[PDB]
Design a protein around this ligand. Structure first.
Ligand SMILES: Nc1ncnc2c1ncn2[C@@H]1O[C@H](COP(=O)(O)OP(=O)(O)OP(=O)(O)O)[C@@H](O)[C@H]1O
Ligand SMILES: Nc1ncnc2c1ncn2[C@@H]1O[C@H](COP(=O)(O)OP(=O)(O)OP(=O)(O)O)[C@@H](O)[C@H]1O
Ligand SMILES: Nc1ncnc2c1ncn2[C@@H]1O[C@H](COP(=O)(O)OP(=O)(O)O)[C@@H](O)[C@H]1O
Ligand SMILES: Nc1ncnc2c1ncn2[C@@H]1O[C@H](COP(=O)(O)OP(=O)(O)O)[C@@H](O)[C@H]1O
Lengths: 358, 1552
C-alpha cells in the first residue's frame, strides 16, 4: 500500500521508516532516472537540488526534521509560466522546471513532530511496524508456509477481481487478432475451435470461481481464525523483545532478528519433519517458536534476568492459550498490587509469622 | 621555520613548555635577555629570573619568584656559548651541580648541629639563613634519617642502651629552638624557612616517638622501611646519584631541580598512605589516580611528593582552559626532560577531548611500562613513544598522575587508584598552630576543626561561604600574624602568657564576620561560645578612625553611630572594610542593591585621607559597560601593536606615577557585576601573585598602595576561584535602615540649594515634614504596607524613596515659583504647611503603588486615609489618585485641568495628535516633576495604552528639550548609544575633564529609549546597555574607550517606556539600575476618558457631514460601550490574540472617516450602517466559535438600538452588510449578489492568467476578500491572518492585491538568512513604498520569522510607521535624495531633512500594507487587524467538491434515495442526486479524518494536522483515478465491439 502511495501522488511524499528498507526501495526504483542521495544537514544540498532541478533528476533528502524552508516554493508546486517557459523563484535565483522531476523527503525516526506548514504540503507515507502490521505479516507468512493451498486460494480470490478479467480480455483480443488474420476460413476451423474451446474452459473456470467465492472466503476465514493465536503470540514476542531494552542497554534487538527466529522455526524445524496433521503442526510450531525465541534471546542475556524473560513468555503463552482463566487480578496483585497501603489492622496473628510477612 | 622551532625544542627539551610564538620570541630576542625572564617561570619549577652580569654576558646565578637567589659555584658565560640552547642547558646543569654542592655543605653543617645538645640559636639562624628553604629542609631530613639509621644499626642486640631516645631528645631541643625563634621578628624568607623546618621536624618527632619506639630495633624492620628514609653519599661524581631517596622497596634519585620557596604540605596519615601508594605505583611503572572529593588534598599531595623528590611538577587544570596544540608538546616535554604532570580533575574534560588525552596518556604509560621489562631491564634501545605523530624518547623519571572525583577504560589497567576522601584536619591544624608559635597547638586544633565543621553545617548555605581546609589554613596563618603583632605591641612598652584562644577567636571573627549575612552572625557567635566556653572577642577601638569617620559623615550628610545607635551596623561594616583593607588587597564589597556599599568605601577613603594625610583617589570602572577587549586592550593580528585597555591604562598610569601617583591611596572600584569572562586576567593580580599578564608580554605589578574593589550586588555568576582569593565584606540590607535614609534626605534638603531664599523655603518645608519621617511615622508605615502590595516591577525601597524625594524637591520648587509669581505677599507659614502636607500625601500616593493597577492604588489610598491625620478629599466616590494639590493648598480634581481641544478634520486619528485626558494630565505633571531633577523614568503599561505618544507629546511640549526616539531591539548594545552621542553630541576638553554635551546650546537632549527592557539578557544575567545607562545615571559619566578618559555627561537625560516584564520577550531590569528610575504604570484609559477623547474625534469627524453633527455624542457613547463589552469578555485566557486596546478604537474611527471622506450627504442610516460594518470587521471576525460571532452581532445591534432608539432597524435585519468600491466610484454598501458575480469573474480571470490552479469561490472566501480589500483600503492598514496552513490565506491576499493594483512582496527565507538580509529587505520595501507612490502588499508568514529581531523590527514598522534604525550614512543620504525627487514629482518643497522624513513616513503609512499569517506576542496581535481565517466549513467543503467534480460523468438516473446521511445541512436538493451524494460522501470523508485525528489525540497522540490542501489533493486524485479507470473501461468496451463486428464478418466469410 505504501508503494502504491509512492507511485501515484501529487504532493511530494515524505518517507518515514525506522529501517532503511524504504530508502533502498526508492533507490532501486529510480536508478534508471539517476536518483541522487542528499541530506538537509549537508552544505552541498542547495547545489545538489539546483543541479537536479536543472536536469529533472529525482532527489531524496534525509534528515527531514531539520527541514529547509527554501524548499517551500518547490513543495507548493508554484509555477511562473511565462513566455512558454515554466519558471520558479528559489530565493534570489530563478530556475526552470525540467519535467519528470520528483523529490522524496526521508527520515529514520518514527517520532518526529513536523510543523503544520510542512504537514500540508507533503503526503505522509509510514513504514513503522506496529502490532497489526507484524500480526498480519506473520499471518501471511504462516498461511504461505503451512497451508500453501489456502494461500493459493487467497491469491486466486485476490486476482479474480481484476487480474483474471484482464487475462480473459487479453485472450479474447488474441482470438480477435487471430480471426482477422485468418479471415474466418473454414480451413482454419481446427485452430479457431481449439482457441475458442480454451477460452470457454477459462470462462467456465472463472464462473466456477465466482460461484464458489463464498465457500472459499469462509474456508479462508476459518483457517485464519485457526492461525490467529500464533500470529498474536508472535507480535507479543517481538514487542516484548523490543521493549527488553529498558532493563539493560545490552538488550537491543531488531525486526530482522525476530524474522530470523520466525523463519528458522517455520522451515528449518526438526520437529516438523514427520508431522503432517495441521493442528499438530500448529501446536509444534507454536511450542518451538516459544522455545527457540527464549533460547536465542537468553544466549546473549544476563543470567540474573533469564527468569524475567521466561516469565514474560509464560504470560504471553497464557494469553495465547485457550480454556484458561484470564488471571488479570492475581497477576496485577503479584506485580504491583503488593504495594497498596494496608498498614491498618496488622495483627501479629500466629507467632511464627513476622511483621512484614503479616 | 616550524622545523627549526622543533629542532630548537629538541636541543633544549624544556622549550616544549613554552609556546610556538613564545619560542619565536625567545629565538628572535636571544641577544637581549630582558625579555627572557618573563617566560623563565614556565620551564623551571621556581626559577623566575637569572642573575646576569652588568653587561648580561655571564649568568652568575638564578633567582626565584620570592626573591631567593642561588649563586652558581662556577658561573657560565653567554659570550662563550652564544646559541640559546647550549647555554641554557649549561645553566640547567650548573644549577643542579650547585644545588648538590650546597646540599653537601649544608649536610656537613647539620651533622655537627644535630650531634649535639642545647644548640645555640645564633649559629642555627646563621645556618638557615645561609641556605635555601628547600636546602635546609633536605639537610634536616638527611641528618635525621642518617642519625636514626645509625641508631638502629647500633640496636642489633635489642633495646639495651638505645640512642633513639637521644635522637628524640635532639629533635625536641631543635623544636624548642625553632619555636623560640619563630616567636620573634624574622624576615619573611627566614619566616618561611622556619615554618618548613618546624613542620618537617614535627613530622620527624611524631615518627620517631611512636612509629620507631614501639620496641623496634632492626634497621631492616618494615616499620622503619615504610617511612621515608634519606641516604646521602657525596662521594658520587654524578650529581643525580649523590642523594638517594627510598620508600618501602622503591628507590629514586633526587632530581635536584630548583623550586624556590614552595609551600611545604603538612605530613598526615592520609598524606603518608598517599606517598606509599604513589611510590609503589611508580616502582611498578604505573600511573597514580588519587581520586576523591575536591578539596581533600589530591593535586597538592602529588605536587608535594614531586617537590620531595626534587622533580618539576606541572598542573593542567581542566576548567575549560584546555587545548591540544599545547598539551601534545608539553607531554613531549614531560617525556623528554623528566618532569611530572598532574591533572586537577579529569572528569571535567569533554568526551572527545578526554578520549584523545586518554589515548596519548595510554601511549606514554605503555612506553613507561615497557621501560621496565624484566627481560629488557638493560634498556639498550631507547624507550620511545608516539606523540605528535613522531618518535619521542621517554625518560624513566617522568611520571603522570590523573586526579579524579571514573577512570576511562583505557587506563584502568595502567593507573593505581587511591581514595583520599577525608584528610586528617586535626593534625593539619595542630602542625600549623605549632608552626605559628602557639604552645598549645593540639587543643586549639581540637577546638577549631569541629568549629569549622559546625560553621559548614549550622550556617545557612551560601555560594560565597567557604569553610574548606584552605579556609581553615588561612585563618590559622592570620592568627599567627595577629599573635606576632600583639607580641610586638606588648614588647614595645617571655611574653608567653597570652590568651591564645582569644587570639584565634579574634582571627577567625576578623576573617569570617565580614562575610556573614546578618542572620548568621548570632549563629556564628553561639557556635564560638559552644566550642570556646567563655572566651570573648574584643574589637579594636580605632578611636582616631572613629573620629575621622564621624567628621566625614557629618560633612557628607550621613548618620553616624556606635554599636546599638542608628547606623552602628553601617559603621561596623566600614571598620570591617578597613581591617580587610589592612589584611589584604582585592576586597569584595557585596550586598543587596540599595545597601550602603559605594558610599561606605567613599567615606572610608576620605577618612583615611584626612587621618593619615595620604591623598586618596578612587577610579570607578564598570566592567559590563564595555567589552572585555577594550577593558584590557587589544593586540593587532597584523601589526602586532598593542593598545592598552581601561584597566591596563589605569594600572600603567599608577605604576609610572608621572604626576606622583604613588604616595597616594589608589583604589580601582569595579562597580557592576562579576562573571568569569572579564575576571580571568584578574586572578593573577588578585592573589599573592599581584602581577598582570598582558598577552603581548608586558608585565605589570600591583604596587602595595593599590587595592582592587568590586562593588557587586549578588555575587552569583562568579567562580569559586575569584571569591576564594578575596577578603570579602557583606553589606546586608538590614545594615541600611530607612531612618538614616530619611535623615540624609532631610539634611540634604536643609543644606543643598535645589538650584538663600530657596534655602529658607527648603528649611521651612523640611521643618514641616520632619514629623512624618519618623521611625513609625506615615512614610515608614506606608512603605511597609506598599511592600506587601503588588507592583508591575520588583519594588525596591531605594527606588521608591528616591522618587518620593524627587517629588518633594519639585514641591519645594513649586513653592519657590509661586513666591516668584507674587513678589508681594509671599507664601505664608500656614499655607505652606497645608500645601506641603497635602503634597506629601499625594507624593506617597504617586510614588508608592504608582507602578500598580488602579485597584491597588485605591487600596493604598484607603490605607493612607486610615493611617494619616492630614485632611483628605472629602468626596467618597472618587479615588484620591484622581485629585491633586493646588498651589493654594487644597485638593482639586484633575478633571478641572483637562482642556477641551477641537482638532481639524484631516487630523482625525493622526499618528501624532494627542487629546488631553485625566491620565494624560496626570502623567504630564509627573513627567515634568521628574524631569526637573533629570531623573530617568520608565513608563510601563500594556501594549497600546498610549505610553509612547503621551511621552512624545509631553517631551515636545517643553521648548528647551530635544527629543530623540531610540528603539531598543533585542540585540541592542552600547555602540548604538555611542553612535547617538556622536551624531547629536560633541566632546569638549576645555574644563577639568572631557565633557560630552549636545551641539545645540541650552538644549537638554533627552534620549527617549522605548522598550527599555527588550534588550536580551546575556549568559551571566546582565544587560550591557542597561548597565551602561546606570553608569551614566549614578556616576554622571562614562569612560570614552578611544583614549580611556572619563568624559562627564552634561545636559543629557534618559527616558524609557516598556511593556510589563511578564510579556514574552521582556526581561526584568536589574535592581541596581531600577533604583534610579521611577516607574509609572500607564493602565488602559478609563471609560470616561475614552468617551471624552473619542467624542472629540467624532465631533471633528462629523463636520464633514453637517446633518449628523448632533449625532456624534451617541455614536461615541455606543462605540465606547461596545468596546467595554468586548473587553470584559474575550479575555486573553480564552485565546492568545484576544487583546483589546484603544488602538482598536483609533483604527475604528479612521475606518469610519475613510468611508465617509468621499461620500456626501449621508443620512443617519448610512452612519449607523458604517459603524456596524466597522464593528463587525474589527471585532466579530477575530473570534473562533460561532457563538462568539453571534453574541457580537446581537450585542452590536442591541447597543445600536439602545443609543439610537428613534432610528429604525433598516440597518439591522441586513445580515451581510457588505461594503465595496469596485462597482461604483466610492465605498458604497453594495448588494451581495452582484458583487459576488463580479468577484467570481475577477478571480476567474485571476486564476486564468496569474495562477495555475483553479480557485473556487464560497461565502467564506467572499467575506474574507471583503475584509482584505477593506484593510488595504485604509491607511496604516495591516492584517493579522490566523488560520490553519493551506487554507489559502496567502493566495486570497495575493488575489486581492492583484485586483486592487498593489504589488506583492515576499521575503524569500532560507537557512542562511540573517538579520542584515532582513533589514536590507525592509530598506528595499520602504524605499519602494515611501520614495515612490507605489503601493506594496507585504506577505508575512510564520515560517519567514526565525529570530525575535525580525518580529521587533516589524513591530516598530507597524506602530511607528517607519524604523529609524534602517537608514544611516550613505543609505540615509540616498533616502534624502530619492525622497526629495519624490517630493518634487508630487509637487512639494523639500525644506530640510526632518520635514522630508516626515513626508516619507506619511507616504509609507499611506502607501504600505503588511499582511501577517500565523497558525493558531501581544504586541503583534495589537497594531494589526486580527482576522480569523478558520478552517473550511462543511458548506465550504461541499461547494469546493461540487465545483471540482462537475467535469466528471457522475450522473446516474437510476439512483435510489436512501434515508439519513445527515452531513451537509444545506444539501442542495431534498432528495440528493448521484453527484450530490458523492460530494456529501467526500465531505463526510474529510469530517471522519478530522474525527479520527481527534480520537487519536485523545488516546495517546502522534497526530498530523489535516488541512484543506489534503482535501484538494484527494479531489485531484479522485478526478485522475475516475477519468483513468473510465477511459480504460471505455477503451476495453470499444475493443470488444470492434472485435464483435470483425467476428461477424468472419462468420459471413464462414458462410461464404
Ligand atoms: N550614614 C550613612 N551611611 C551610608 N549611607 C547612608 C547614610 N545615611 C544615608 N545613607 C544613604 O544610603 C544610601 C547608600 O547607597 P549606596 O550608594 O551605598 O548604594 P550602592 O551600594 O551603590 O547600591 P547598588 O547595590 O544598587 O549598586 C544612599 O541613599 C545614602 O544617601
Ligand atoms: N490621549 C491620547 N491621544 C491620542 N491618541 C491616544 C491617546 N491615548 C491613546 N491613544 C491611541 O492609543 C494608541 C496608543 O498608541 P501607541 O501604540 O504608541 O501606545 P503605547 O501604549 O505606548 O504602545 P506600545 O507599548 O505598543 O508602544 C494609538 O492608537 C493612539 O492614537
Ligand atoms: N597534606 C596537606 N597538608 C596541608 N594542607 C593541605 C594538605 N593537602 C591539602 N592541603 C590544602 O588543601 C588546599 C587545597 O585543596 P585542593 O587542592 O582543593 O584539594 P584536592 O586536590 O583534593 O581537590 C590548600 O589549602 C592546601 O594547602
Ligand atoms: N478557495 C479556494 N479554491 C481553490 N483552491 C484553493 C482555495 N484556497 C486555497 N486553495 C489552494 O490552496 C493552495 C495553498 O494555499 P495557501 O495560500 O498556501 O494557504 P495558506 O496561505 O493558508 O498557506 C493553493 O495552491 C490554492 O490552489
Amino acid at each position: 500500500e505504501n508503494a502504491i502511495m509512492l507511485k501515484r501522488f501529487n504532493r511530494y511524499p515524505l518517507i518515514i521508516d525506522p529501517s532503511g528498507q524504504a530508502t533502498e526501495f526508492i533507490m532501486n526504483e529510480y536508478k534508471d532516472r539517476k536518483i541522487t542521495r542528499t541530506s538537509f544537514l549537508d552544505d552541498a544540498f542547495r547545489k545538489n537540488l539546483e543541479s537536479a532541478l536543472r536536469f529533472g533528476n529525482p532527489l531524496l533528502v534525509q534528515d527531514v526534521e531539520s527541514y529547509d524552508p527554501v524548499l517551500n516554493p518547490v513543495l507548493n508546486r508554484e509555477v511562473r509560466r511565462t513566455g512558454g517557459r515554466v519558471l520558479i523563484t528559489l530565493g534570489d535565483q530563478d530556475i526552470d522546471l525540467s519535467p519528470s522531476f520528483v523529490i522524496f523527503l526521508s527520515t529514520r525516526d518514527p517520532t518526529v513532530e513536523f510543523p503544520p506548514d510542512l504537514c500540508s504540503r507533503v503526503t505522509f507515507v509510514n513504514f513503522t511496524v506496529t502490532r497489526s502490521s507484524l500480526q498480519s505479516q506473520c499471518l501471511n507468512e504462516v498461511l504461505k508456509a503451512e497451508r500453501p493451498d489456502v494461500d493459493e486460494k487467497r491469491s486466486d480470490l485476490l486476482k479474480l477481481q481484476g487480474e483474471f478479467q484482464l487475462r480473459l480480455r487479453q485472450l479474447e483480443k488474441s482470438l480477435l487478432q487471430a480471426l482477422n488474420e485468418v479471415k474466418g476460413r473454414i480451413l482454419d476451423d481446427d485452430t479457431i475451435i481449439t482457441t475458442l474451446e480454451n477460452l470457454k474452459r477459462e470462462a467456465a473456470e472463472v464462473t466456477r470461481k465466482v460461484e464458489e467465492t463464498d465457500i472459499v472466503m469462509q474456508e479462508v476465514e476459518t483457517v485464519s481464525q485457526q492461525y490467529l493465536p500464533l500470529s498474536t503470540a508472535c507480535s507479543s514476542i517481538y514487542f516484548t523483545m523490543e521493549s527488553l531494552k529498558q532493563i539493560h542497554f545490552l538488550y537491543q534487538y531488531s525486526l530482522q532478528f525476530f524474522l530470523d527466529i520466525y523463519h528458522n522455526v517455520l522451515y528449518e524445524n526438526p520437529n516438523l519433519k514427520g508431522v503432517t496433521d495441521h493442528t499438530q503442526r500448529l501446536s509444534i510450531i507454536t511450542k518451538d517458536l516459544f522455545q527457540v525465541a527464549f533460547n536465542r534471546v537468553a544466549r546473549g542475556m544476563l543470567h540474573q534476568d533469564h527468569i524475567t524473560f521466561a516469565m514474560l513468555l509464560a504470560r504471553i503463552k497464557l494469553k495465547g492459550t485457550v480454556g484458561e482463566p484470564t488471571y488479570d487480578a492475581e497477576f496485577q496483585h503479584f506485580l504491583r498490587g503488593n504495594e497498596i497501603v494496608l498498614s491498618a489492622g496488622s495483627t501479629p496473628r500466629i507467632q511464627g509469622l513476622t511483621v512484614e510477612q503479616a | 621555520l616550524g622545523e627549526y622551532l622543533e629542532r630548537e625544542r629538541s636541543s633544549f627539551p624544556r622549550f616544549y613548555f613554552v609556546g610556538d610564538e613564545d619560542l619565536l620570541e625567545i629565538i628572535g630576542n636571544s641577544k637581549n635577555v630582558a625579555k627572557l625572564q618573563k617566560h623563565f617561570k614556565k620551564m623551571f619549577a621556581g626559577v623566575s629570573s637569572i642573575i646576569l652580569n652588568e653587561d648580561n654576558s655571564v649568568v652568575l646565578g638564578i633567582s626565584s619568584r620570592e626573591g631567593e637567589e642561588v649563586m652558581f659555584k662556577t658561573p657560565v658565560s653567554i659570550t662563550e656559548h652564544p646559541k640559546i640552547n647550549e647555554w641554557l642547558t649549561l645553566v640547567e646543569k650548573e644549577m643542579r651541580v650547585t644545588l648538590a654542592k650546597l646540599l653537601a655543605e649544608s649536610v656537613t653543617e647539620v651533622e655537627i648541629f644535630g650531634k649535639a645538645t642545647s644548640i645555640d640559636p645564633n649559629t642555627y639562624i646563621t645556618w638557615i639563613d645561609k641556605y635555601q628553604a628547600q636546602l635546609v629542609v633536605l639537610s634536616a631530613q638527611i641528618a635525621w634519617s642518617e642519625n636514626v639509621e645509625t641508631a638502629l644499626s647500633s640496636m642489633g642486640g635489642g633495646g639495651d642502651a638505645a640512642p633513639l631516645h637521644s635522637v628524640l631528645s635532639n629533635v625536641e631541643v631543635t623544636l624548642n629552638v625553632l619555636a623560640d625563634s619563630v616567636l620573634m621578628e624574622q624576615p619573611p624568607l627566614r619566616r618561611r624557612k622556619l615554618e618548613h623546618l618546624i613542620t618537617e621536624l614535627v613530622h620527624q618527632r611524631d615518627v620517631t616517638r611512636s612509629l620507631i619506639k614501639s620496641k623496634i630495633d632492626n634497621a631492616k624492620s618494615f616499620e622503619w622501611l615504610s617511612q621515608m628514609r634519606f641516604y646521602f653519599d657525596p662521594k658520587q661524581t654524578d650529581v643525580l646519584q649523590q642523594l638517594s631517596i627510598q620508600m618501602a622497596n622503591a628507590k629514586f634519585n633526587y632530581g635536584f631541580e630548583y623550586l624556590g620557596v614552595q609551600d611545604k604540605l603538612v605530613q598526615t596519615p592520609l598524606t603518608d598512605r598517599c606517598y606509599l601508594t604513589m611510590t609503589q605505583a611508580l616502582e611498578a611503572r604505573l600511573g597514580g589516580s588519587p581520586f576523591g572529593p575536591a578539596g581533600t588534598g589530591k593535586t597538592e599531595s602529588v605536587k608535594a611528593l614531586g617537590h620531595q623528590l626534587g622533580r618539576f611538577v606541572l598542573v593542567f587544570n581542566c576548567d575549560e582552559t584546555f587545548d591540544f596544540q599545547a598539551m601534545g608538546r608539553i607531554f613531549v616535554g614531560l617525556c623528554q626532560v623528566g618532569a611530572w604532570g598532574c591533572f586537577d580533575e579529569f572528569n571535567r574534560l569533554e568526551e572527545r577531548m578526554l578520549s584523545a588525552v586518554s589515548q596519548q596518556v595510554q601511549c606514554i604509560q605503555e612506553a613507561l611500562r615497557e621501560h621496565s621489562n624484566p627481560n629488557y631491564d638493560k634498556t639498550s634501545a631507547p624507550i620511545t613513544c608516539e606523540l605528535l605523530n613522531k618518535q619521542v624518547k621517554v625518560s624513566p623519571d617522568m611520571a603522570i598522575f590523573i586526579t579524579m572525583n571514573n577512570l576511562p577504560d583505557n587506563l584502568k589497567k595502567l593507573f593505581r587508584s587511591l581514595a583520599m576522601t577525608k584528610p586528617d584536619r586535626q593534625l593539619i591544624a595542630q602542625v600549623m598552630l605549632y608552626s605559628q608559635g602557639f604552645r598549645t597547638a593540639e587543643v586549639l586544633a581540637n577546638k577549631i576543626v569541629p568549629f569549622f565543621k559546625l560553621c559548614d553545617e549550622q550556617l545557612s548555605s551560601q555560594s560565597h561561604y567557604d569553610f574548606g581546609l584552605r579556609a581553615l589554613k588561612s585563618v590559622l596563618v592570620s592568627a599567627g600574624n595577629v599573635k606576632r603583632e600583639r607580641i610586638q605591641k606588648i614588647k614595645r612598652e617571655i611574653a608567653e602568657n597570652l590568651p591564645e584562644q582569644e587570639i584565634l577567636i579574634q582571627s577567625v571573627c576578623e576573617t569570617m564576620v565580614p562575610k556573614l549575612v546578618a542572620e548568621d552572625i548570632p549563629l556564628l557567635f553561639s557556635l564560638l561560645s559552644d566550642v570556646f566556653p567563655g572566651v570573648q572577642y574584643h574589637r579594636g577601638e580605632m578611636t582616631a578612625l572613629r573620629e575621622e569617620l564621624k567628621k566625614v559623615c557629618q560633612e557628607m550628610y550621613l548618620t553616624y553611630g556606635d554599636g546599638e545607635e542608628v547606623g552602628g551596623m553601617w559603621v561596623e561594616k566600614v571598620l570591617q572594610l578597613y581591617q580587610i583593607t589592612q589584611i589584604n588587597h582585592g576586597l569584595m564589597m557585596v550586598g543587596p542593591s540599595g545597601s550602603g556599599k559605594s558610599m561606605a568605601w567613599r567615606v572610608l577613603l576620605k577618612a583615611l585621607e584626612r587621618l593619615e594625610g595620604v591623598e586618596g583617589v578612587a577610579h570607578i570602572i564598570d566592567p559590563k559597560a564595555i567589552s572585555k577587549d577594550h577593558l584590557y586592550g587589544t593586540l593587532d593580528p597584523n601589526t602586532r601593536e598593542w593598545t592598552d585597555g581601561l584597566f591596563t591604562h589605569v594600572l600603567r598610569k599608577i605604576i609610572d606615577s608621572v604626576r606622583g601617583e604613588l604616595q597616594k591611596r589608589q583604589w580601582i572600584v569595579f562597580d557592576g557585576d562579576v562573571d568569569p569572562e572579564w575576571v580571568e586576567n584578574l586572578n593573577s593580580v588578585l592573589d599573592d601573585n599581584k602581577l598582570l599578564t598582558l598577552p603581548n608580554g608586558e608585565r605589570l605589578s600591583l604596587p602595595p598602595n593599590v587595592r582592587i574593589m568590586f562593588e557587586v550586588q549578588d555575587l552569583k555568576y562568579a567562580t569559586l576561584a575569584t571569591v576564594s582569593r578575596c577578603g570579602m565584606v557583606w553589606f546586608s540590607e538590614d545594615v541600611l535602615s530607612t531612618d538614616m535614609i530619611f535623615n540624609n534626605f532631610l539634611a540634604r534638603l536643609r543644606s543643598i540649594p535645589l538650584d538663600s531664599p530657596m534655602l529658607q523655603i527648603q528649611r521651612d518645608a523640611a521643618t514641616i515634614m520632619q514629623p512624618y519621617f519618623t521611625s513609625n511615622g506615615l512614610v515608614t508605615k506606608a512603605l511597609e504596607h506598599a511592600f506587601q502590595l503588588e507592583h508591575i516591577m520588583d519594588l525596591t525601597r531605594l527606588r521608591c524613596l528616591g522618587s518620593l524625594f524627587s517629588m518633594l524637591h519639585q514641591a519645594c520648587r513649586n513653592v519657590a515659583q509661586y513666591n516668584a509669581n507674587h513678589p508681594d505677599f509671599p507664601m505664608q507659614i500656614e499655607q505652606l504647611e497645608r500645601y506641603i502636607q497635602r503634597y506629601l500625601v499625594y507624593a506617597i500616593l504617586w510614588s508608592l503603588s504608582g507602578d500598580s493597577r488602579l485597584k491597588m492604588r485605591a487600596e493604598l489610598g484607603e490605607y493612607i486615609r486610615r493611617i494619616t491625620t492630614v485632611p483628605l478629599p472629602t468626596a467618597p466616590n472618587i479615588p484620591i489618585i484622581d485629585y491633586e494639590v493646588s498651589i493654594s493648598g487644597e485638593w482639586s480634581p484633575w478633571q478641572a485641568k483637562v482642556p477641551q481641544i477641537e482638532v481639524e478634520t484631516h487630523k482625525v486619528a493622526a499618528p501624532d495628535v494627542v487629546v488631553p485626558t485625566l491620565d494624560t494630565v496626570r502623567h504630564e505633571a509627573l513627567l515634568y516633576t521628574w524631569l526637573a531633577e533629570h531623573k530617568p523614568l520608565v513608563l510601563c503599561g500594556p501594549p497600546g495604552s498610549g505610553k509612547t505618544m503621551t511621552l512624545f507629546s509631553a517631551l515636545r511640549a517643553l521648548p528647551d528639550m530635544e527629543v530623540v526616539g531610540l528603539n531598543f531591539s533585542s540585540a541592542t548594545t552600547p555602540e548604538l548609544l555611542l553612535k547617538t552621542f556622536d551624531h547629536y553630541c560633541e566632546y569638549r576638553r576645555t574644563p577639568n575633564g572631557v565633557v560630552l554635551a549636545p551641539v545645540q546650546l541650552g538644549k537638554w537632549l533627552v534620549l527617549f529609549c522605548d522598550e527599555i527592557n527588550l534588550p536580551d539578557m546575556d549568559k551571566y544575567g546582565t544587560q550591557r546597555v542597561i548597565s551602561f545607562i546606570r553608569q551614566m545615571v549614578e556616576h554622571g559619566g562614562f569612560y570614552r574607550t578611544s583614549d580611556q578618559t572619563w568624559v562627564k555627561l552634561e545636559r543629557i537625560q534618559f527616558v524609557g517606556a516598556c511593556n510589563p516584564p511578564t510579556d514574552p520577550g521582556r526581561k526584568p531590569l536589574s535592581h541596581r539600575f531600577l533604583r534610579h528610575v521611577p516607574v509609572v504604570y500607564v493602565d488602559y484609559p478609563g471609560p470616561a476618558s475614552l468617551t471624552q477623547i473619542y467624542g472629540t474625534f467624532n465631533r471633528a469627524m462629523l463636520r464633514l457631514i453637517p446633518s449628523l453633527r448632533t449625532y456624534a455624542e451617541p455614536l461615541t457613547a455606543a462605540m465606547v460601550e461596545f468596546y467595554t463589552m468586548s473587553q470584559e469578555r474575550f479575555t486573553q485566557d480564552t485565546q492568545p490574540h484576544y487583546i483589546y486596546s484603544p488602538r482598536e478604537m483609533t483604527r475604528w474611527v479612521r475606518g469610519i472617516f475613510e468611508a465617509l471622506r468621499p461620500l456626501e450627504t449621508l443620512p443617519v442610516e448610512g452612519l449607523i450602517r458604517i459603524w456596524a460594518h466597522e464593528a463587525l470587521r474589527l471585532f466579530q471576525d477575530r473570534l473562533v466559535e460561532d457563538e462568539e460571532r453571534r453574541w457580537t452581532d446581537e450585542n452590536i445591534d442591541t447597543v445600536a438600538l439602545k443609543h439610537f432608539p428613534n432610528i429604525d432597524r433598516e440597518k439591522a435585519m441586513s445580515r451581510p452588510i457588505l461594503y465595496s468600491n469596485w462597482l461604483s466610484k466610492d465605498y458604497i454598501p453594495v448588494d451581495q449578489e452582484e458583487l459576488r458575480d463580479y468577484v467570481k469573474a475577477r478571480l476567474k480571470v485571476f486564476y486564468e492568467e496569474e495562477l495555475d490552479v483553479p480557485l473556487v469561490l464560497f461565502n467564506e472566501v467572499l467575506d474574507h476578500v471583503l475584509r482584505i480589500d477593506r484593510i488595504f483600503r485604509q491607511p496604516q492598514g495591516h492584517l493579522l491572518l490566523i488560520g490553519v496552513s493551506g487554507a489559502g490565506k496567502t493566495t486570497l491576499s495575493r488575489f486581492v492585491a492583484w485586483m486592487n493594483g498593489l504589488s506583492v512582496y515576499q521575503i524569500k527565507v532560507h537557512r542562511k538568512y540573517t538579520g542584515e538580509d532582513f533589514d536590507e529587505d525592509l530598506r528595499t520595501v520602504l524605499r519602494r513604498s515611501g520614495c515612490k507612490n507605489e503601493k506594496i502588499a507585504f506577505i508575512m508568514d510564520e515560517s519567514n520569522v526565525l529570530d525575535s529581531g525580525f518580529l521587533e523590527r516589524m513591530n516598530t514598522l507597524l506602530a511607528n510607521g517607519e524604523v529609524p534604525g534602517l537608514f544611516e550614512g550613505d543609505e540615509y543620504a540616498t533616502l534624502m535624495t530619492q525622497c526629495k525627487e519624490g517630493a518634487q514629482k508630487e509637487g512639494l518643497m523639500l525644506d530640510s531633512h526632518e520635514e522630508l522624513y516626515k513626508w516619507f513616513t506619511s507616504q509609507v503609512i499611506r502607501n504600505l500594507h503588511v499582511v501577517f499569517t500565523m497558525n493558531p506576542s501581544p504586541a503583534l496581535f495589537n497594531r494589526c487587524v486580527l482576522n480569523w481565517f478558520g478552517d473550511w466549513s462543511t458548506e465550504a467543503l461541499y461547494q469546493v467538491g461540487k465545483e471540482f467534480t462537475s467535469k466528471m460523468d457522475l450522473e446516474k438516473p437510476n439512483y435510489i434515495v436512501p434515508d439519513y446521511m445527515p452531513v451537509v445541512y444545506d444539501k442542495l436538493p431534498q432528495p440528493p442526486s448521484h453527484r450530490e451524494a458523492i460530494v456529501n460522501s467526500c465531505v463526510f470523508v474529510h469530517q471522519t479524518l478530522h474525527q479520527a485525528n481527534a480520537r487519536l489525540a485523545k488516546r495517546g497522540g502522534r497526530t498530523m494536522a489535516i488541512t484543506p490542501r489534503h482535501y484538494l489533493d484527494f479531489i485531484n486524485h479522485y478526478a485522475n483515478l475516475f477519468h483513468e479507470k473510465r477511459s480504460e473501461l471505455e477503451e476495453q468496451q470499444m475493443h470488444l465491439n470492434v472485435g464483435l463486428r470483425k467476428i461477424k464478418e468472419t462468420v459471413d466469410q464462414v458462410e461464404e
